[PDB]
Structure 1
């Protein structure tokens, strides 16, 4: 695309915030900034690293339902996002956030960028970087804590080449998985038999 900025409309104002937007869009490229707009309820501007990332986000996220609303994702005519008059969202978090230095961006080198799955939303999220003996029940209890729908089923892949786990989280619908992605991505999981917590990674 001609610009690294996109606009997202049809967000749920009570549910969404900058981190939760990042948690969805980071699947498709580096996210630099998210800005909610007082005058356009349900809309946010998102600056990605480049127009290739914008295009991937549009092609994969445009027209998807989340919290009863159709999300629309489209190119912005702005070349960049600037902090405006920042305000507190419904959840008490700030309307503007810069993620350019985030450890959780996944496309920071060309080599790293190429390893990311680029898939359309479906009713399954893949997870990785979970604790070594993570269980279905562990994910159930995290979803309860977050106030999001439990997956109907959790698969933990048996094969493990590091002290971490990967697998699948399944819901009955696309929209349930997408709604959950924004809340659950980058959750800090407690690590029993291990000294540091694990940052849960989700993707389609």
Structure 2
């Protein structure tokens, strides 16, 4: 009892399967809860199930993402009739990745304890993304370079926040439209940014901002 959704599994239609894979779905839905599994459906092109940690995550994802547009398609986000995603009958996507993926052990999940969960603000989709965990000396040009690599739209404005006694940078990335930002989110979240000072790339973390501008 508690959440409205009677399953931790949502169904999402309206995905662009020429662009989306399980990682890119996780890149969107991880803003709303822990993502345990994603499975693209054999029966239904452009649709995927997404198992969250619980129903409250489903309620948030539906509330914020239903009827949003991505790649000109209208997304439909609703509770699944299924209580869990089972692995059976998986297939390879065109990019060679599996139609099913388990993300339950991902270090990129953001709701793994209540106190971690609490640090996620309400995530109403907007045209500005907040970025965290970028390299200390990141520049707008760095982001342009990565967006070009990924084949996504460059942000129209980038703001890096001031920081001290901080081992990574954060800031704001703005696009002209909400769909521009959402489209980018799915491609750019968790991008592995170069670390000149240590072995591990910086995992770029994005979420939605309430800021009107990256100014």
TM-score (norm 1): 0.97
- Give deviations 1:79-131, integer Å, cap 9, x for gaps: 11101211111222110000001110000011111011222111001000000
Query: Secondary structure of 2:117's match?
Result: helix
| 1:65–1:160 CA distance, 2 compared to 1 (3 A) | farther
Moved more, 136-145 or 159-168: 159-168
Report the counterpart of residue 140 of structure 1 in structure 2. Answer: 144
Aligned residues: 204
Q: Does 1:153 align with 2:157?
A: yes
Residue of structure 2 aligned with 1:178, choices 167, 170, 182: 182
**Alignment partners' CA distance in 1, 2:179 and 2:164:** 30
**Alignment partners' CA distance in 2, 1:81 and 1:151:** 35
**Alignment partners' CA distance in 1, 2:165 and 2:118:** 20
Moved more, 47-56 or 82-91: 82-91
Query: Secondary structure of 1:183's match?
Result: helix
* 1:161 Cα offset (Å): 3.8
- Contact kept? 1:124, 1:177, Cα under 8 Å: yes
- Contact kept? 1:189, 1:200, Cα under 8 Å: yes
Query: Secondary structure of 1:29's match?
Result: coil
| 1:163–1:31 CA distance, 2 compared to 1 (3 A) | same
**Alignment partners' CA distance in 2, 1:191 and 1:71:** 36
Moved more, 157-166 or 92-101: 157-166
- Give deviations 1:147-184, integer Å, cap 9, x for gaps: 11111111001234412100001111100100000110
Residue of structure 2 aligned with 1:47, choices 44, 51, 55: 51
- Contact kept? 1:27, 1:118, Cα under 8 Å: no
**Alignment partners' CA distance in 2, 1:21 and 1:3:** 19
**Alignment partners' CA distance in 1, 2:164 and 2:172:** 14
**Alignment partners' CA distance in 1, 2:99 and 2:198:** 36
* 1:135 Cα offset (Å): 0.3
* 1:140 Cα offset (Å): 0.3
Query: Secondary structure of 1:196's match?
Result: coil
Query: Secondary structure of 1:79's match?
Result: coil
- Give deviations 1:63-88, integer Å, cap 9, x for gaps: 10000101110011111110121111
**Alignment partners' CA distance in 2, 1:190 and 1:179:** 23
**Alignment partners' CA distance in 2, 1:193 and 1:5:** 41
Uncovered stretches (5+) of structure 1, i.e. residues with no partner: none
